[model samples]
Target: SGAIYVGNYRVVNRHLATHNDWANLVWEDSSRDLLVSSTTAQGCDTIARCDCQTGVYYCSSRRKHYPVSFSKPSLIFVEASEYYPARYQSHLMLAVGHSEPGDCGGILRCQHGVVGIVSTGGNGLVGFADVRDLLWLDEE
Candidate 1:
């Protein structure tokens, strides 16, 4: 009936850049983890786990540009380039396609480079802005 709050969780290696089409705003409560790969790009796939923990997110794929092959109404196809950091959150390595045929949209491929922002307030605030500048730190 309502949205459940799973506070202070991190989406590690979950690659939101490539597969923003299949990206979900809500977190899944199921036991099965999400697997990602590309038949066109990589012959094999890799598995990513997001258990909502406090850890650094890693990007597995490299950075490069790929063409969007899907078409819209009237068979008019537009090209969009997916590129990302040479290491993380690049648009190229993140463009995720759907696993099934005739699906509505595609999933993304990011390595969980972005961390989830936590709300310190007891209740969720309407105007709360998550200042994530501190989260971008050099891990040397």
Candidate 2:
């Protein structure tokens, strides 16, 4: 497990043994908005911006962007792992880690954290990918 402080929010990552192949991050706040920089399978890496204000959001990709509506404010976390299939080089497979809750909760309440893997190239090519900076949209 790992923990990081983003502004006033404390984000933690925990491995899930039940599934034996996954992990998740937990946070204390569910009211704040979130934005993440992600890379797709097609290699179209982009920033994924989300609005946790409840109602509608503009989810985007490197090539395009779209609008998605939710019944309530939601937070989505994603995880990625390196996989090797056939004779091709190892690549990444992204998965949903967790989401925000519908009802409001307290600081002790744990919320899911986001996870991701860096590409096979760039500075992350040799060592483990590290999160340099995390931007939090804390609105009360």
Candidate 3:
């Protein structure tokens, strides 16, 4: 099945860390590669909650989930949304390590010294409940 927009709820044994794990970046290239150029996070700062995210990114994108481009990784992040937290989080997580400093939309630059606010491969999501078929909306 070749589709860009997908639910991919039944993720394989990867998604980054091996063995069905959610967090583990040491010695894991997949996990490490997610960080793009940075190999490990210095450490995500103290967790502070945002006012009204009621929405956010991965731990979810690692469904390996994405509507990205083969020309992405560099072409991505070019159009960051008003929603910049996920932007920073993706930078922190994939550029350095899986530190989702984006869960609450609280911090802007996990770059708190490492926020690297704008970088490559900013992953997010898409959904259409009650319908799980894959789609390639660009085939026009």
Off by over 4 Å in 3: 1-44, 52-116, 120-140
User: TM-score, each model?
Assistant: 0.15, 0.18, 0.16
For candidate 3, list the clashing residue pairs, or say none. 34-94, 35-94, 35-95, 109-115, 110-115, 111-114, 111-115
lDDT of 1 by residue, 1-140 (tens): 00111222222222221353135332321111111222222222222232222332111122222222221111111122121122211111111221211111122222542222111111111001111222312111
Candidate 1 deviant stretches above 4 angstroms: 1-38, 43-45, 58-140
Native-referenced Cα lDDT, model 3: 0.21
Steric clashes per prediction: 18, 3, 7
Model 3, 44-134: lDDT tens digits are: 2222222221222232223332221111112122234332322222212222222232222111211111111112232432211111111
Off by over 4 Å in 2: 14-127, 137-140
User: Candidate 2 on 24-110: residue-level lDDT in tens?
Assistant: 222221112211222122221222233221111111112211122222221322223332122222212212122122110101101
lDDT for each candidate structure? 0.20, 0.21, 0.21
